[PDB]
Design a protein around this ligand. Sequence first.
Ligand code: CHL
Ligand code: CLA
Ligand code: CLA
Ligand SMILES: CCCCCCCCCCCCCCCCCC(=O)OC[C@H](CO[C@@H]1O[C@H](CO)[C@H](O)[C@H](O)[C@H]1O)OC(=O)CCCCCCCCCCCCCCCCC
Ligand SMILES: CC1=C(/C=C/C(C)=C/C=C/C(C)=C/C=C/C=C(C)/C=C/C=C(C)/C=C/C2=C(C)CCCC2(C)C)C(C)(C)CCC1
Ligand SMILES: CC/C=C\C/C=C\C/C=C\CCCCCCCC(=O)O
Lengths: 34, 60, 37, 158, 62, 220, 257
Amino acid sequence: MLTLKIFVYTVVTFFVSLFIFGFLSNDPGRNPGQ
Amino acid sequence: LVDDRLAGEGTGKILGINDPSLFWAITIVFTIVWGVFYVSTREIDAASDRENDDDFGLTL
Amino acid sequence: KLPEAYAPFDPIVDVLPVIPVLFLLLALVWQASVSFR
Amino acid sequence: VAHAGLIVFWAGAMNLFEVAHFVPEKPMYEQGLILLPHLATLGYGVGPGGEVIDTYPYFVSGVLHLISSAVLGFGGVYHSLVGPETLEESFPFFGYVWKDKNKMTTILGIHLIVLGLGAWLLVWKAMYFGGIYDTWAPGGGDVRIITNPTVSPGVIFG
Amino acid sequence: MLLIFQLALFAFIVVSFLLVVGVPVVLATPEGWAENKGTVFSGIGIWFLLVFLVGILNSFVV
Amino acid sequence: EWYGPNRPQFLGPFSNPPSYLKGEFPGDYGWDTAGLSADPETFARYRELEVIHARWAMLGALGCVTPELLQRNGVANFGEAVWFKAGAQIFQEGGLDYLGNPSLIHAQSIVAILLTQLVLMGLIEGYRVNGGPAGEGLDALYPGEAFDPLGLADDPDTFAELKVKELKNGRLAMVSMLGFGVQGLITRKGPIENLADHLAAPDATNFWVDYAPKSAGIGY
Amino acid sequence: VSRSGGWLGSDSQNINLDKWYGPDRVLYLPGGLLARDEINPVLNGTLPGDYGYDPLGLAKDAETLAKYRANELLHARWAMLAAAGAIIPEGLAANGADVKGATWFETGAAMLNGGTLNWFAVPFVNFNNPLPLFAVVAINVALMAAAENYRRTEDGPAGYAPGVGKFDESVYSNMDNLYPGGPFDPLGLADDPEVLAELKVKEIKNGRLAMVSFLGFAVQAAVTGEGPYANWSKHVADPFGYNLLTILSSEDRAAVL
Ligand code: CHL
Ligand code: CLA
Ligand code: CLA
Ligand SMILES: CCCCCCCCCCCCCCCCCC(=O)OC[C@H](CO[C@@H]1O[C@H](CO)[C@H](O)[C@H](O)[C@H]1O)OC(=O)CCCCCCCCCCCCCCCCC
Ligand SMILES: CC1=C(/C=C/C(C)=C/C=C/C(C)=C/C=C/C=C(C)/C=C/C=C(C)/C=C/C2=C(C)CCCC2(C)C)C(C)(C)CCC1
Ligand SMILES: CC/C=C\C/C=C\C/C=C\CCCCCCCC(=O)O
């Protein structure tokens, strides 16, 4: 059961870190504005 | 008892971490993603053809 | 209850809290009088 | 400023309305009061066991709030009607531009300092100015004085 | 002393009502704020004096 | 004297000053046997270090002898009169009271003392090395002006004489402070107590007889 | 080379005299409540501390303004000294020191029959001043009379002061009636016109604050009946339980409901 907890924690933190560091990567500049 | 269980419900642990293994998993994954993101920030900023001075950003 | 010295002014207290709603209505009335320019 | 005056006006008027409709033969929660229990938890006009003993502090709080609301409302009306329209040329200290990051950060810091002072003002009440109502006090709930607050990082982070 | 305190409170109420109805009218007229400043200043001073007097007199009636 | 080729030397009649010690600065007795001041820049830095150390040592020696003397004479009463135990009074129940009465300082926290000293001393030392309220372009070591209220050093010759006297007194203070430290370390007693014990029985109370035989294989 | 500088590093003085002198100086009312044309023409922003506050037309011309400024400066300095010496000994004695007649409105009564006034040379030694009442009054009267006669004469004897040095009876020539300087300024802080002007403004503001403070001291002594330090200590201990309104109520108030 602890192995499942470790695996789920790893997956969740991976996806949340992807979300955070993607929204930090100059997102308000990816628009078709002139 | 008859069986065994984690027995962590309703305890009040910080971030639910009852194990240094969980702490290490969180820290290692976060650090890996941050390190991959860190080196590309100079290239990503240069895609807007502007310098990251005090006037940078989306402003109105 | 209010102190004995403030008893005659009880009716004034009973109507105070509606004044903010009256203020919103007054803003609408002012806009109407200005003719919604 | 006018909106802040409106908020203070509602606070004072509602406190006066609730203090004028309060009977001592019923508990606070049985009479539809929501502002009076806030002052009771601060240790104002309450006794052992949770029985209301005095009422004058509630009246004082309401009157002070109402008069301060009058002052704030006058200030807001002045600044909205006949005050300067754009205070970036006559009052450079108070003037700002939405796109000037440094000025916005400075204003944010000033208001953070003000909020921290407010939190410390709350802290001083429970220590030196009579304390606050403690419902877990030995021998029934009563207005205690907090002498040993828990400032342990493990407790706060928990 | 009670009658004096009640008279002071009534005077405070009427002065507050006069200020509430008059200050926006004075401030919202063209070239009215720049001329009728003395009346508004005297009204504000009387308001403050009345509130201080009522606060002082409250200590004897309560 | 005190300057030029005819100044007194650090060995007496056996005089042999180095080539870079011409006798231009106060306290120049021609003692550089290690060649540590052959570089003029290092010489200037060493001069400033020596003067500052001298002044600090004079203040420290006076502050280490005063409260213990007052307490031993019975004039005053302190929580800890000994110089190497005065810092621990802040951990006592009554706090730190100046000269014993609770109406003078009544210090209670060590963090506040640390932070206030950090801020104040940093500001005043930055003033000293850069210039502040008391001046902007004065001398590095002898600024004068606001720090010489009652002018004692105005004639150039009296200025040099006072420089020499200050340096010699400060050097004596440095030696006394080193003695204080080492000699309270060995004996675990204050300087005044050591002086009284020696003056009681000079032959019996000393360093050699008292502690030297127990300096190898035996406890002190 | 300079005799003054900034307190916060290099190039950190930034003295702004246009805020306290000239046509752009700050007045006693904000710009939206009083135009600059309503100011008395005599108050043209030349003297330090000029806030343009003269409602009851008391500054007829330059001579009256100068006389009132001299009186105000003297009163402000005396108020500084009085406030300090009336607030400090009482707190010293209340914190645990041995001071007789600490309260300011009782020191005179302390030395009435045979009482003696101990002097605390903080923080070193508490003295046992043995001067009796008659000697004290004679010495104080003599010294104050001599000093004030010297002030109005615009001349003085010969002595020695730090900084200036040994001066004869001629240094008093060309000395200002209000800012004499010289022997009275040993540290030489009054050497830069900008620093001198800002110091004058600071002095006049602190003096006005001290005057208001001592008026409050006198009124508090008349009403409450104890020393100014006791009032402050009790109010800080209990803000809502010890103030003017609480003191005024001569009897306890029955509980409201
Ligand atoms: C907190 C801010 C603060 C700042 C920014 C400075 C800044 C400065 N100080 Mg100052 N000081 C400050 C506080 C204090 N100073 C001093 C006392 C001195 C002295 C005596 C001297 C300076 C000097 C200097 C300059 C160079 C020092 C350096 O290179 O570090 C060196 C870094 C070290 C960590 C020093 C290590 C200590 C040293 C090797 C010996 C220590 C010996 C033991 C304590 C044993 C003694 C016990 C015996 C006596 C019983 C520099 C401008 C020096 C200067 O340049 O003079 C021209 C100088 O000589 N300062 C004291 C008294 C304790 C201070 C606070 O209390
Ligand atoms: C909320 C913040 C706020 C801010 C940032 C400003 C900002 C400004 N005001 Mg306005 N004002 C306010 C509220 C505010 N005001 C209120 C509540 C009133 C009613 C009294 C006024 C009445 C007012 C007047 C009459 C004038 C201005 C003018 C100005 C300018 C300052 C110059 C000056 O002399 O004013 C100083 C104004 C003061 C009221 C005196 C100082 C009072 C001290 C600072 C108060 C100490 C109280 C403390 C902060 C506790 C408050 C309780 C809090 C928890 C609510 C500047 C643009 C002036 C300008 O020139 O406009 C053309 C001017 O004419 N204001
Ligand atoms: C407005 C003026 C003023 C007046 C009239 C008083 C009056 C008084 N004070 Mg207060 N005081 C004042 C301001 C004033 N004070 C200020 C500004 C402070 C410092 C913040 C104090 C601090 C203070 C203390 C600490 C004490 C008093 C006390 C008293 C009494 C004095 C008892 C005594 O023994 O003195 C004796 C005084 C002296 C012998 C005077 C010495 C002054 C020296 C000589 C300076 C002259 C300078 C000159 C250049 C020196 C050159 C010579 C050089 C070669 C050596 C008396 C009622 C005492 C008390 O018990 O009252 C309750 C006491 O304990 N006062
Ligand atoms: C605080 C920094 C924020 C930075 C930016 C964050 C961006 C977030 C992006 C979206 C992510 C959403 C999904 C998150 C999934 C992981 C969390 C999870 O499932 O935890 C689930 C775990 C459950 O942990 C359980 O614990 C038990 C013992 O207590 C047992 O051990 C269980 O086995 C264990 O699973 O809970 C936590 O980890 C606690 C999280 C506490 C978070 C406190 C945040 C404080 C600061 C913010 C305050 C405001 C928060 C919002 C409030 C209002 C909301 C309407
Ligand atoms: C600008 C504008 C606006 C707004 C405004 C506002 C928001 C205002 C406010 C205002 C205010 C906010 C005000 C206030 C006032 C107050 C007052 C005036 C008070 C008074 C009081 C009194 C008088 C009291 C009394 C008493 C006592 C003392 C005790 C007890 C009893 C009694 C209660 C009686 C609008 C929307 C219209 C729109 C347009 C623009
Ligand atoms: C090179 C040294 C520098 C910095 C390192 C400093 C501190 C490291 C401290 C802790 C690391 C492990 C953290 C464990 C968190 C708690 C885990 C648990 O609750 O089981």
